[PDB]
Amino acid sequence: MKTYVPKQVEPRWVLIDAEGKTLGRLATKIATLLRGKHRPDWTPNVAMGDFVVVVNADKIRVTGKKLEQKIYTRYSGYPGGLKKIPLEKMLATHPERVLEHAVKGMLPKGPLGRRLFKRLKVYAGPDHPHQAQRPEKLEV
Amino acid sequence: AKHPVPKKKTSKARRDARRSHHALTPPTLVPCPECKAMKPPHTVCPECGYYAGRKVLEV
Amino acid sequence: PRAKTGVVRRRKHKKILKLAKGYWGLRSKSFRKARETLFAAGNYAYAHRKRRKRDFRRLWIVRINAACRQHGLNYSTFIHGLKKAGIEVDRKNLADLAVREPQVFAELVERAKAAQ
Amino acid sequence: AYSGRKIWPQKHTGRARHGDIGAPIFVGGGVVFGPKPRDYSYTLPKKVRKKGLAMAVADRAREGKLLLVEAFAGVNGKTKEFLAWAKEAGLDGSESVLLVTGNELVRRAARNLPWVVTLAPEGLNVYDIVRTERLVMDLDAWEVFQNRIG
Amino acid sequence: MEAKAIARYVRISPRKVRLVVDLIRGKSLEEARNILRYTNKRGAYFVAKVLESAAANAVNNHDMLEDRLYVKAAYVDEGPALKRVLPRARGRADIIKKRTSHITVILGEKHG
Amino acid sequence: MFAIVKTGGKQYRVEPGLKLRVEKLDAEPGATVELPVLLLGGEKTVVGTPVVEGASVVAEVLGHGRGKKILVSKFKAKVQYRRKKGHRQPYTELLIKEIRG
RNA sequence: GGAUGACCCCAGGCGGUAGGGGAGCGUUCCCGAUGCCGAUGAAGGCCGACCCGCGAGGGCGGCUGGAGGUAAGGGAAGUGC
RNA sequence: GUGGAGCCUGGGAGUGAGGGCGCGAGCGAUAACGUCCGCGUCCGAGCGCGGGAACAACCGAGACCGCCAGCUAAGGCCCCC
RNA sequence: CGUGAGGGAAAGGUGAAAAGAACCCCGGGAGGGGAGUGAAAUAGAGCCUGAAACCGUGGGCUUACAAGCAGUCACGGCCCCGCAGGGGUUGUGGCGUGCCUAUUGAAGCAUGAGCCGGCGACUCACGGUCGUGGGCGAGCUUAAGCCGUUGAGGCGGAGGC
């Protein structure tokens, strides 16, 4: 009978407070919301997931010794250009990245998966500039 | 020098895309105020012999 | 007598070349190149035919799973429920239900928590 | 007709390897296993020949297409003369005829007909029979025929 | 109506003329004549001769008006190359392809 | 009102007015078959378990056809194995007439 | 089952290099041919989303082409890149 | 025990560079993607399909074709998936 | 081409008939546009058919955050043919290590191949050995020749098995 495939719809804006939430145990979910696997009319090639505003990213909670033991990492393309920055220091300067880098590596690779990442808005909050979109609050 | 040489035939696409800057630009021209003919600015108009705005050149 | 190639080869070549229309550059211009893509096109169409049957099922199961967590339980439970219920509506149609006829699916969900 | 000189060195030319240009691998070259004059003749067992003539005539007779004649009315060479006679005999050229006779004159009359294949009796043979729809013979030919198959 | 003139077997190389033809495609016979005039390229001379010829044809055979002629379409095609020997170092002969162009120009009339 | 019916090993949701392609059934064109039902939908919502005892769906057999040709070709590298097969799938075209219960 | 290749039913086998075997396709040429097709268009070419064949292929149609072509059944090879 | 079992006679072969893995030894150094034998296996010829990130030979499984149907194997069921 | 012995090519086709395109127009010419001839002039002499590589022009779809053996699967958008369907294209998603050869093993950074077209390799003779379709069977068969034929076959027993 051919399978459903939806015509385009209005994307639902969602609000989430991090704060005390385990990084990535949270990120996991944001990812799902991004893809829209929570919507029963989900399509793989389409990008119909929610726009996800997270607020209070600075107050993400982490297990173990990772504050000073997880190291984020960037390579320029120069000799010795491997940059190693510890979690601590990441929170210390660009906190909204920590959750940003986590959600991304949980998104598919490819054109679309970069599209969905754009739909992630992260603010070491609270307060996000998206009063315009009226994001429905979500729990976990 | 050890006689360097193309490894692969350049594809038609890759070829022509070299030539995306090969296109000519038309001669820039203005009307000569006297005789009205088109000519390159800052030249003498070879049609009437005039430049600013006198006879310069017996044509 | 002599049977010169004559007409035969050109024809076997066009057959292939017509089969190769669409392909990038020489793959649609050069017979040989045509043949090599077509071989690959060959297996891919076979391999992906078999694969299409399991691409849709994974999709159905995604789509169903979502609809299932709307009513407060998971795909794996739900499916167990059906089997216990004795409901064998394939998940092609399970999917459709979940997206066209919410209510019926919601019926199916209850029979499923029921039989559990 | 070409020489047999090694067109160019076995090595170091960067070209492939070749001897002379008569090599069948050259467009100049000779053909590999091409026709040579042969002889397709072979000796078919006399008996088989004998049985075929036999069986060829048999089949035809089994179809009432065989017709023996005593002689040939007024055919004295002329083609229309033969026509006449053949008409009177049920031979209108709707059917094709192997006409077998040692009579020179009758053969000459029948010869130039398209629907007639003529033949002296020592010349009888299964093919010329099978080709033709209707066999028509002399008594005098019919004899030599039976003598061939004795 | 269309008038066309072709120059065949012009002993210039197609990729070189095409550069000049490419300038005047779609321009007003007036514009074209001008462009070609002060176009610094051997091809101009030739494209000119083809434009001009096609201009007459229009006016002269096909009842069209000079003040209305534009270049509806044009194109250069490759004709048979003149294969020439270029002797090189250490005994080797090279083969130069002096190339050959068929230059086409097709004039149409500008309605308004 | 729709039902979910089973035929040729697959299931489909059918409705009155549907032309539907199924695996070839042994059945003359113009004849008319009854498909078993595993669920009935809209207004009356009845969940066959696995089939709903009374129900059926009546369809008319418009006729039979052979689907568009599928080129099934296998190729094996470095081995000179190449097979070419032409495959047309036979089908039966159905006009769903009514639903029962 | 029928009565011997006619089809139907039922069951089982059907990855595959070297390689063995079996059934076909197409090319040139001969018999068929004093024939048949052919200018109301041969061969050949370019199309096709149509028909037949598992397939190699074969039709049918349109355009080109302008003088050849060659069946059912057989025969023989300079037979398929 | 009726199996692409077997035995007999004849036509045609290819093969006679193997390889990895498990196990048993010799050599080696209780080294080597080592080497040399034995039993077995798989790749060879299953570089077809699932797992193993990738990956001939480890696990799973011997692919006639089609399906937008169902049960499973190894492996898995946080997101990529 | 080679001092020479010697080596040794390529290159066939308008049409039924030259009726081989007067005259005019752009042009130094070449070429072309008209006119004219012709059943046909993309049969116009660079001439029958006019394949493919290859080069252009015009039209449709497409493409400047994208990762690739170039495809395939699915869905979607735009163009087209039509009026539950087709055709073209391809945005996104899944999947995906060219062909040949040689190899224990090749996408392989091992061989061969620029692309297209045409040429290119399991034959023939005489013996042999199985199989096989036939003929005849304690028998079977002729060879060279001769006669005949002018695509007609017959005779020939020497001989062989």
Side-chain angles (χ1 to χ4, degrees), chain D residues 31 33-35 38 40 113-114 127:
Chain D
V31 344
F33 283 139
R38 51 189 192 150
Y40 292 70
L113 251 40
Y127 179 70

Side-chain angles (χ1 to χ4, degrees), chain A residues 16-19 21-31 34 52-61 70 72 87 90-91 94-107 117 120-124:
Chain A
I16 289 172
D17 175 42
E19 177 142 53
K21 292 185 184 303
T22 292
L23 164 70
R25 261 201 152 92
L26 162 55
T28 258
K29 298 163 196 150
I30 309 178
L34 265 8
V52 167
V53 187
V54 175
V55 111
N56 257 331
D58 52 302
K59 328 247 176 181
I60 212 94
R61 247 69 166 294
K70 206 225 204 49
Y72 290 110
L87 217 193
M90 198 60 69
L91 296 168
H94 306 89
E96 55 282 310
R97 253 115 94 150
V98 172
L99 199 253
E100 252 169 29
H101 182 266
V103 182
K104 176 181 271 182
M106 285 166 194
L107 301 169
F117 177 79
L120 206 215
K121 256 78 175 200
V122 163
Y123 302 95

Side-chain angles (χ1 to χ4, degrees), chain B residues 2 33 44:
Chain B
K2 279 169 177 114
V44 167

Side-chain angles (χ1 to χ4, degrees), chain A residues 3 28 35 37 106:
Chain A
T3 295
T28 258
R35 307 195 65 187
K37 274 158 121 189
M106 285 166 194

